[PDB]
Every structure is written in structure tokens, then in C-alpha cells.
Write a protein that binds this DNA or RNA. Sequence first.
DNA 1: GCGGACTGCTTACC
Length: 898
Amino acid sequence: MKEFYLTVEQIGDSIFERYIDSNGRERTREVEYKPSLFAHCPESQATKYFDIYGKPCTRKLFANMRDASQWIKRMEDIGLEALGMDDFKLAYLSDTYNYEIKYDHTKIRVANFDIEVTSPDGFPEPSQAKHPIDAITHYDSIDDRFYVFDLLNSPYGNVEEWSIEIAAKLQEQGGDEVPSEIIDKIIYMPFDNEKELLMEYLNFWQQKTPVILTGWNVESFAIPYVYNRIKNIFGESTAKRLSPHRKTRVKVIESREIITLFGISVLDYIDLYKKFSFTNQPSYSLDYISEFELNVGKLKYDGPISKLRESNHQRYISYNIIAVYRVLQIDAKRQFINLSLDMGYYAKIQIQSVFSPIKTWDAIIFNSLKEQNKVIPQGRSHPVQPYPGAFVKEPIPNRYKYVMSFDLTSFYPSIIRQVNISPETIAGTFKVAPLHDYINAVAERPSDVYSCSPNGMMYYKDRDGVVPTEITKVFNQRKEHKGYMLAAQRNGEIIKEALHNPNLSVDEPLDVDYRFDFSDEIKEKIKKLSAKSLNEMLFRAQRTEVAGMTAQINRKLLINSLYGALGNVWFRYYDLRNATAITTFGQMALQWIERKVNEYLNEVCGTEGEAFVLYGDTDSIYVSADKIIDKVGESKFRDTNHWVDFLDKFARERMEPAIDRGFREMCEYMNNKQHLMFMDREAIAGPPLGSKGIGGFWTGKKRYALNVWDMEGTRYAEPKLKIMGLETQKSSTPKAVQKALKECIRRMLQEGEESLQEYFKEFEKEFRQLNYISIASVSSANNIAKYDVGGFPGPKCPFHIRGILTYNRAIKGNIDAPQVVEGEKVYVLPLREGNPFGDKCIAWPSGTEITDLIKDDVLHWMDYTVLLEKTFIKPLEGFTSAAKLDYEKKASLFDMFD
DNA sequence: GCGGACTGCTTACC
Ligand SMILES: Cc1cn([C@H]2C[C@H](O)[C@@H](COP(=O)(O)OP(=O)(O)OP(=O)(O)O)O2)c(=O)[nH]c1=O
Ligand SMILES: [Ca+2]
Ligand SMILES: [Ca+2]
Ligand SMILES: [Ca+2]
Ligand SMILES: [Ca+2]
Ligand SMILES: [Ca+2]
Ligand SMILES: [Ca+2]
Ligand SMILES: [Ca+2]
Ligand SMILES: [Ca+2]
Ligand code: NA
Ligand code: NA
């Protein structure tokens, strides 16, 4: 096989590289890397190297890397540009791997681990590591084994060995329900004291040194705790054994510590999740996320965690094993590790650099330029400046019965490729007219020769740009994976349909590739399968869709981040001229097509001057299709699915070609390199046929709800609500309130005013029986100490921060009580006046039951009235007033009758 | 006593 690196580090004049060789075996080499940097040279000096602008450069080979850096410093002191890749690790990877890296992930050692630390006096600070590590479960992806390190003897209690027999048993058997599929993969190692455990773990670590190291909060807790515990007990020299190159770096931010283990790529899964999952969670405990991702139950245990080991060591160890497995399960679904490996090996960077799109792109562009013997520019210092972004239309707050949406494919990257925007493709500038002059095709055509953006920039049309070139490569990967996703999604609905008439028989789920649309044979067979087989296929379909979703939405994130990078001062190719060129072109593009779409629809409908586009954000338009429906009349339709097919055919056969023409014209207007403004229909929304549902509504910018029947070619078996911006979508809104508001919205859009009022009346009556967590608000807890004046709210103290202070005062003096962590999220509850807490609200760590110390008092003093009106009624008022509805039956003259 | 303007903070949408 082809060789591929695992990890790379720069230690002084040495490059330390772990890699897999041609025989598939992991090796480690210390290379005295001789890096090259470049300087401009006279035209007469013959060379093969040029900067991106065509200026010749002479290559300076250096004896070592530290000499190359000192030269950069000198070139600064002289006042001359020092060109080339200054991050020598990247240069090394580029040299050593001069080809598209094909990697075998089975050879890459991925370690999932989690430790347990019993602490009687609150949260065990990793920087201190005062308390013994009494459990470590370490899963090795190569061995496919869970290595369990169990401390039987601790100053906090002596316990018996964990029983794998009891662990396997059902919880109803007094067992721990450790998944049967991993029972045989567990390797249990009890220890009679902490020192022997840690030394054995270190030796274990050396034998099976992690390449990818992950888990939940491993970077903020596990790794630094383990490192500091081993450091405190055995000394710094043995603690460094955690690094295959025996070098670590303690980065301090008081005290807080993030330890850097050279030779290991740490991908904390909480960070992978926060960056790649595109969720915003009320809590980020592994418990909460697992329940959300895997629909598994919360890990139930009786007492407090600080006593769990003493009371139920059996379950303590079992839960530790499960916590490791749950991350693996989440990763099996989300596939963020795979994503990081793909992106990482594609860019030729340290795998952990996937968290930095700038670093990611700097390397991609660098490697692409190195291919053509071209020399990258030196990074420069720039002041941060604001610059304009997208256009968002101000919608008329109202209900909207029939709505079709249209969205541009990969907008900003497409703008980049179309205009050919790149640092080295800048041709010059032109005198700009007001933006609306270009929108209305009134302004003079910017250039006859160059490709233009209405911001004033001109670009060469002939030559290829390294930014368009490399953004196009990644975009193609994105388009491919989105295809698999949508197909999985479409296949999902097919199974959902067949699940309406499940055949009474015993069979097995069909072997199919869900990434591709089911064949007619497959669809025929599906209608004959049982519920068990169908539900299993629906599950695999959804799993395939999620896998496709991760691959596509994150490649989309990467290319959109290339745009964003252009507006970031730390990007080597930062340039507001290009960034604004993109956004301004974007603003034009959207509003140009708004006019075009309006003109076409007035034309084909027969109307004149009517506004068909009711809303738009960046690259989308929402078209009021009431008159398209009415020109045929509701009468001529069999069922709801009929007019959905009608609008589907209409958008596809009539509107899209018109849009294609409208954009193709715009492309000539700007004299762009290549027409890439591809705006396809997205949503088809409307009420059920013959129902009293309103279909949809807008309350303002970025706030709307639609009863969608079809989405990008996916015909749902049951209509799906597309709600944007509204409280139902906000993590800050209580779970039960989201659920209730959503049902309110559903009823408005699908059933009508009478149905809404009915549900509202019922909710108002019964809502006081809702669990306190389900009605608690959520908020991030930033700058608590900023507003902490003697335990009391300082000036301008935010509501939720006030709640935290109230909490701190209530639990003052309990070391065992859970502390609110700065930056993390909290549940927030209003308190009725005269409550013994002394304030109008309270707050506690999210994802947890509030401590038993004060729980019963909080429950008794919750302000349900405030909770209802503030959280439920007020947003519902906004929804209904916008939609011209009432959630309560208004008073009439008819109230004088019986 | 408090509504309106403004600010800080939060979390949405692209
Ligand atoms: C979602 C998102 C969009 N944007 C900008 C750039 C996008 O091109 C533009 C449109 O956003 P989107 O239409 O949401 O995403 P997209 O058009 O780029 O790709 P597609 O629609 O085919 O799935 O908004 C960002 O800069 N960052 C983001 O996270
Ligand atoms: Ca734990
Ligand atoms: Ca059970
Ligand atoms: Ca011993
Ligand atoms: Ca889209
Ligand atoms: Ca888009
Ligand atoms: Ca059937
Ligand atoms: Ca969009
Ligand atoms: Ca099209
Ligand atoms: Na220490
Ligand atoms: Na249906």
C-alpha cells in the first residue's frame, strides 16, 4: 500500500513523524528537516519559482528549521517579504507525501477513553488532580477491545471486583445492561492501588499509543487530569510518557490547563460534536447527548456521583464502560472521526487542525500552489474591519397559504467560481454605481473584458484561480455526498409509506445500498416485508442519511469557511476586496432574481405589479403561490398530493428555466467566467387540501413556519413543519414549551383557528403538572463573576445570571453541591414573590436535576404564571398576531345568548 | 410609576 503519516510534530530542528509504511506497519522517524523559504529576486536571475503574482523568487535552503525562522525575523527587520510555508510541519508533509493520500483507517490507532475520579469536595480540578483516578476505560480501535482499569482500593473506599456477569444482566435482574455486543470485548484489570494502575496504564499506553485520541471532554478533563495526576505522583518525566516523543506542553489560562501531547492528535468528541453536528444543545453532558443521538435511557443511579463508587462500585465501573461505548455509538452514527481523517489527509495537515478551516485551507492552497512550483505569499498583519454581508428581505408579517421556495446551490462558493475570485486573479477595478442600478440592469456594464462583482472588483476570466480551483474540488465531494443523503432521505419516505401496510410474516430486512434510490424490484419487495424488517430498514436508511449529512454539510461548512477566511485577518489570503466582492455579488444576485421571478410570475399568471416573492435571505426566495394555485382553482385537484405534484412540475418545468435565463443574463451583465448561479426549488408548502389550516406564516426576518409537503425532491409521507427562528427552534426555550408551541403551530398551519384555541385552552389548564425541567428555560452562563457583587446581582445583571447568584446563595456551604460552571449552560426558573431564595429567579447546571438540598423548595416556589405568559403566551401572541389568528376566542355580541 | 430608547446578552439564520 501507499505510505501515509499518522502524526507530525516540530521539536526544534527535528520533525517527529509517526507513520504507516508500505507494509502497513507503524513506524516513527526523527527527520532533521531542511526547509526552504523564498525571497523575491531580479527578473534576470533564472528560476523555476514564482509567487502567485508571477514575480520570480530564489529558493533559500536552510540547514535547519530554526535557521529558517531566524531568517524570517531578519527579513522583517530589513523590511522585505519572506515567502513560502512558514509552518514547517506542513512543508514536511507536503514534501514527504507528494500525492493524494489514500489511508487505511484500520491501521490508525483510535483510542476512546474516559476516567472516573471520586471527589467528596466538589468537582476534581484537573490542574490540581488531588483525587485518585479510580477507573479508566480505554477502547482501542485496532484491538477492538475495551481495556478496563479498575481501582479496588482507594482512600475513599475499598470495593470488590466488578462482575462482568452482573454487568451483562438486565437492570431488571439487578444488572447494569452493558450492551451484549461489547461484553466479549471487555478486558478487565483490577488493581490493589492507584500507583500500580497508572504505571500499568502507562505501559499499556506505550504498547498501544493512540494516534487519534478521543472521548467526552477528554481535552478539558481526562487528559489533563491523567497527566497531572501522573505528574504529581511519579514526577514530570514519567508523565511525559503520555507523549510518544516524550514532549508535552502545559498551556495555562487561570487555574486552567490544556496539556498538549506531542505526537498525538487529540479530537475531543465534544469539540467535534459542537463544530460538525449543527445542533445547539441545552446541555452537553454525555448523558444528555447520548439520549438525543441514540435514544437510549438516562443512566439511572440512586445516590450522588460522589458516592456512587462507595455504594455501587459494580454500576460505577459499568457506567464508565458504557460512557466510552456511547461515544463510539455516537461516532458510528455521526462519523466525525471519519470526517476528520478525510479532511485531514485531504489537506495534508495534523488531524486536529480540522478544527481550523484557515489552517486547513492554508495547507490545501499551499499544496496546490507547490504543485505548480509556485510560492505562497507571507502572512501579513491587518486591522479588523467590518464589511457588508447578505441581504435579507423584510417580509410583510402575515399568513401565507401556498408557498414555494428556491435556493441557490452552494451560493458563496459558486459566486467565487463564477466570478473567478482569487488573490492572484484580481484584474483591476471599475467605478461602481449604486447597487440597485445593477439589480435593475440600469448601470453601465462594468467590464467588457474582465469578470466583475458589483463591489468594483474585476478579475481575469482566462486564467484559473487557486481559490476557485480548490474550492471546486471540495464542492464536488460535497455534491456527491449530498446526493447519497437525499437518496437515503427519499428511500426513508418509501419505507415510511410501506409501514402503513406491514405484511404479517417473518422475514429479514433487504440488503440494499441506501445511498442510491431504491430500484423498482426493491420497492416491490419492500411492500411485502413485515414491520420488523421495515422498521429496521427505516433505521438503516436514516443512519445512511445521517452519514451522508455529516459528509455533505461539513464539506459545505469547509468551503463556506474559505469564503469566511477571506474576511479573517489571520488568513494568508485575507482580502476584503474579495470578501466584499462575494457578498455584494450575493446581494445583487438575490435581489436581481427577486425582480426576475416577480416579472415572470406576473407575466405567466396574467397579473401585473403583484409581489410574488414574499421573503428572502442571502440566496433564497419564498414565492407566494396562491395565484398559481388559483389560476387552476382548488377544485381541479384530487387530493393534497395532487397540487403538490402540480407546483413541483410547475417549478421544475416553468420557473427554474426562467430563473436559469435570469441568472444567465446576469452572468453576461457581469461578464463572469462561468454561469454557476443554480437556483432549484426547495420547499413546497401549503395547508392540507380542504382543511382550515393556514399553510404558513412569517412574523418578521428569519422567523417563519411552513407546512412542507416536499423538500428538494423528497415527498414526505406526512407533512413536515419547517419552522425557522421561532421559539420552537431555540435551545433556550423549555422542552415542553417547544413541544406545545410546535403543536400550536402545527394546528394553525394544518387545522385552523378553532383547533389552535382548543389546544391552547387544554395546555393552559394542565401545564402546571409538567415536570419542572421540561418547563425550565436554558441559557449560557457567561461572565458570572462580572455581575457578582457580594453574591448579589450587580448593575445590568442578566436575568439568568441573577438566577445563578440566587443558586450560589442557596447552596452556600455545601461542598457536595453542584457548582455552576462558567461558560456552560443553566436551567432557569422564575420564583413567585416571597420565596425563601430572596430573588425572582433561580438557575442551576443544565442537563441535571437541581440538588436535593433546595429542590423541593424550588418546585414549591416556581412561578408557573410567569413561566406560562413569558415563555408560552408571549411567543404564541407573536405567532398568532402575525398570522391574523386568535388563540383565545374573542368576546362577541353572541355572549348574550345561551 | 413606567414606556420608549438603548444596551448587553443570547441564540437564532444565512
Ligand atoms: C449556512 C452558512 C451560510 N453561509 C453563507 C454562504 C452560503 O453560500 C450562503 C447560503 O447559505 P446556504 O444556502 O444555507 O448554504 P449554501 O447555499 O452555501 O449550500 P446549499 O444551500 O446548496 O446547501 O450563506 C455562511 O457563510 N456560513 C454558513 O454557515
Ligand atoms: Ca463518568
Ligand atoms: Ca431495561
Ligand atoms: Ca500490588
Ligand atoms: Ca438548498
Ligand atoms: Ca443555498
Ligand atoms: Ca405491505
Ligand atoms: Ca439558503
Ligand atoms: Ca435547475
Ligand atoms: Na502538578
Ligand atoms: Na401521504
